[PDB]
Design a protein around this ligand. Structure first.
Ligand SMILES: O=P([O-])(O)O[C@H]1O[C@H](COP(=O)(O)O)[C@@H](O)[C@H](O)[C@H]1O
Ligand SMILES: [Zn+2]
Length: 455
């Protein structure tokens, strides 16, 4: 099996090339062995709407079964529904077969074992099992479980929408279409569907609400239909994008301001987690309502782990993953976050544009990417951490180098998956922005004078 598919927070590969049926079997075998090693024979299995889902999922299950695991096969479901299954069924283990928002031929695995979402060394240990044949052998079983209706009723039952809302819902032909439009309607909305047919060819836009270009159709439809809100789901439904009645894109850090106000209102002192790419206004806002803001590393597995360690009731990150523990289970779920958002907005007489525009806003630069090399990317950050001078900065080095000034901040970090440096800058003044930008440019140039700093 190829080492490259075993990533930091999941397994991901190309089904024609790096991810075969055979590989999927041995991955099931490694996962099952590890679940049993943690005392858990019971494993949920779900898949997204990808074309390779059927061929791959059978191998995954057989691998689990050949360990002696009791598999609950919940069929084609959003990623959060699989996480849900691994919280309400007998077992605390679950595997989601998904390629998230990637092109049609990508697929992969997101893995929970006895409550814990695997990351870093834990994933590499699965591969290690296959290389060493450190694998359990047994006569397992498969049970089919229909979990969607239960998930549906769980959310519907706990959400209390006041006013009615007209909502455009864009699933990008990903697996969220099996539930998000129907659930949102049931909450008390009129749903204008966009690309809600599940189709793993992805013949319209890619199901990635993080890129503005995949929100163009949503925005136009929200305006043309005079809708109250637009929602966009990623391919597997663990991320959601949001646009106001006027077409303004609301980024997750701003979404978290609304959610944190709400969660903290009922839970004084609640820990709230966000990543190093989030606006410094979120920190102040959380603290001002009496919450405990916790800045953490980028990721999904990392934020999820940090939530468990801190007792946090809410987390989010800039890629659109939002994690509710309050009234929920603590995993990322775009569909439930959408429900929670609709609940709050339905209780405000103002339109969604005004609800969000009321919060303070800094001047933000669009995220910046600098292509370096795979050999240098971590070394550049290490060099900044060693040599860089940032003045009275409030320096954070959890994930690259973030520096918080009184009126703004800057971040530089190495992409885990690509040979790229990622930067963000935000300030209250356009003067401040160009000053923080100036400092970072200088410090990168002091590491390598030949580095292409495009700001
Ligand atoms: O890897 P990073 O640190 O650049 O991080 C970026 O890429 C990752 C992998 O993307 P993909 O699944 O499409 O390969 C994403 O999970 C993450 O949200 C994104 O910010
Ligand atoms: Zn996703």
């Amino acid at each position: 099996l190829p080492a490259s598919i075993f990533r930091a927070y999941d397994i991901r590969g190309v089904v024609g090339d790096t991810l075969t049926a055979e590989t999927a079997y041995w991955i099931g075998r490694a996962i099952g062995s590890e679940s049993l090693a943690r005392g858990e024979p019971c494993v949920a299995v779900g898949r997204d709407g990808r074309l390779s889902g059927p061929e791959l999922v059978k191998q995954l299950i057989q691998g689990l079964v050949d360990c002696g695991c009791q598999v609950s096969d919940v069929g084609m479901v959003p990623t959060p529904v699989l996480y849900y299954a691994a919280n309400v069924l007998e077992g605390k283990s679950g595997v989601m077969l998904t390629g998230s928002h990637n092109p049609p031929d990508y697929n992969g695995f997101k893995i929970v074992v006895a409550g814990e979402t695997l990351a870093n060394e834990q994933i590499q240990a699965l591969r290690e099992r296959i290389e060493k044949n450190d694998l359990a052998s047994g006569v397992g079983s498969v049970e089919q479980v229909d979990i969607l209706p239960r998930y549906f009723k769980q959310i519907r039952d706990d959400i209390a929408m006041a006013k009615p809302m007209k909502v455009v819902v864009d699933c990008g032909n990903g697996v969220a279409g099996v539930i998000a439009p129907q659930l949102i309607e049931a909450l008390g909305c009129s749903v204008i569907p966009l690309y809600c047919e599940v189709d793993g060819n992805f013949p319209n836009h890619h199901p990635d609400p993080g890129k503005p270009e995949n929100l163009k159709d949503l925005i136009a439809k929200v305006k043309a239909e005079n809708a109250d809100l637009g929602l966009a789901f990623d391919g597997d439904g663990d991320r959601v994008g949001v646009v106001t009645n006027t077409g303004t894109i609301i980024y997750p850090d701003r979404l978290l301001m609304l959610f944190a106000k709400d969660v903290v209102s009922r839970n004084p002192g609640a820990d709230i987690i966000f990543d190093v790419k989030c606006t410094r206004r979120l920190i102040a806002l959380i603290s001002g309502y009496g919450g405990r803001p916790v800045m953490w590393k980028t990721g999904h597995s990392l934020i999820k782990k940090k939530m468990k360690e801190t007792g946090a009731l809410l987390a989010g990150e800039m890629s659109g993953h939002v994690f509710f523990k309050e009234r929920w289970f603590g995993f990322d779920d775009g569909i439930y976050s959408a429900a929670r958002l609709l609940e709050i907005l339905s209780q405000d007489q103002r339109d969604s544009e005004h609800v969000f525009s009321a919060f303070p806003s800094d001047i933000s630069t669009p995220e910046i990417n600098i292509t370096v090399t795979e050999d240098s990317k971590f070394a550049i950050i290490e060099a900044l951490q060693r040599d860089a001078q940032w003045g009275e900065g409030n320096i954070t080095t959890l994930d690259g180098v973030r520096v918080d000034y009184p009126k703004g901040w800057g971040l530089v970090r190495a992409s885990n998956t690509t040979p790229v440096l990622v930067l963000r800058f935000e300030a209250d003044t356009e003067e401040e922005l160009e000053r923080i930008k100036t400092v970072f440019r200088n410090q990168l140039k002091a590491v390598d004078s030949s580095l292409p700093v495009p700001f």
